[PDB]
Design a binder for this molecule. Structure first.
Ligand SMILES: *[C@H]1O[C@H](CO)[C@@H](O)[C@H](O)[C@H]1NC(C)=O
Length: 209
């Protein structure tokens, strides 16, 4: 026995903004008084149904308000059990922007900004400058977080973040690569999302042999 179970078990459960997830808390009770309760604050765009798997917590079209700790407490026979789970709501960037859009082997730097993101802290969001399938050696860094304000007519509502990462560029090299790549990776409990965005390297350094 347990005798209180939650499906899924994971202590941390990640859900994409606007998606859905349902947690089923079950209690094996030999007695009459058996009672199950879901708490924390409640919300998410979630609900609670009982008697068809004890009590299921369903988060629908998740919002950032969904995130937070949820607790299922089950009472049975003057005895009480629990299971605590953290809902982690996140938003992977829907666009990646590279400045300059293309790289004449000139030289300066390059910036890559991810749009509409959460979370934005390292350990959960990293950027990479790639040449082929490996990170460009000699590239530096510095990443700024920004908040975005929007809500244009006849549909929806809300606010997220725009993170940019800049890189002072090394010489590059011979033979100049056809393109460099910016990659934004998000690593959450159980998952890893990634976005690779091409940045064309202009085959211009001419003039010699
Ligand atoms: C919940 O909110 C999201 C974004 O604000 C929206 O796309 C979705 O349709 C909403 N769900 C409902 C039932 O309104």
């Amino acid at each position: 026995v347990k005798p209180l179970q939650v499906e899924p078990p994971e202590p941390v459960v990640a859900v994409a903004l606007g998606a859905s997830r349902q947690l089923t808390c079950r209690l094996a009770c030999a007695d009459r008084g058996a009672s199950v309760q879901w708490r924390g604050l409640d919300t998410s765009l979630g609900a609670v149904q009982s008697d068809t798997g004890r009590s299921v917590l369903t988060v629908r079209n998740a919002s950032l308000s969904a995130a937070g700790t949820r607790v299922c407490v089950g009472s049975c026979g003057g005895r009480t059990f629990q299971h605590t789970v953290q809902l982690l709501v996140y938003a992977f960037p829907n666009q990646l922007t590279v400045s300059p859009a293309a790289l004449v082997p000139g030289d300066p730097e390059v910036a890559c900004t991810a749009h509409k993101v959460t979370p934005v802290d390292p350990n959960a969001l990293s950027f990479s400058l790639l040449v082929g399938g490996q990170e460009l050696e000699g590239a530096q860094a510095l990443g700024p977080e920004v908040q975005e304000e929007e809500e244009e007519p006849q549909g929806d509502e809300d606010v997220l973040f725009r993170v940019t990462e800049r890189w002072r560029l090394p010489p590059l090299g011979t033979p100049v690569p056809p393109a460099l790549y910016c990659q934004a990776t998000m690593r959450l409990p159980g998952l890893e999302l990634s976005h690779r965005q091409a940045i064309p390297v202009l085959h211009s350094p001419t003039s010699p042999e």
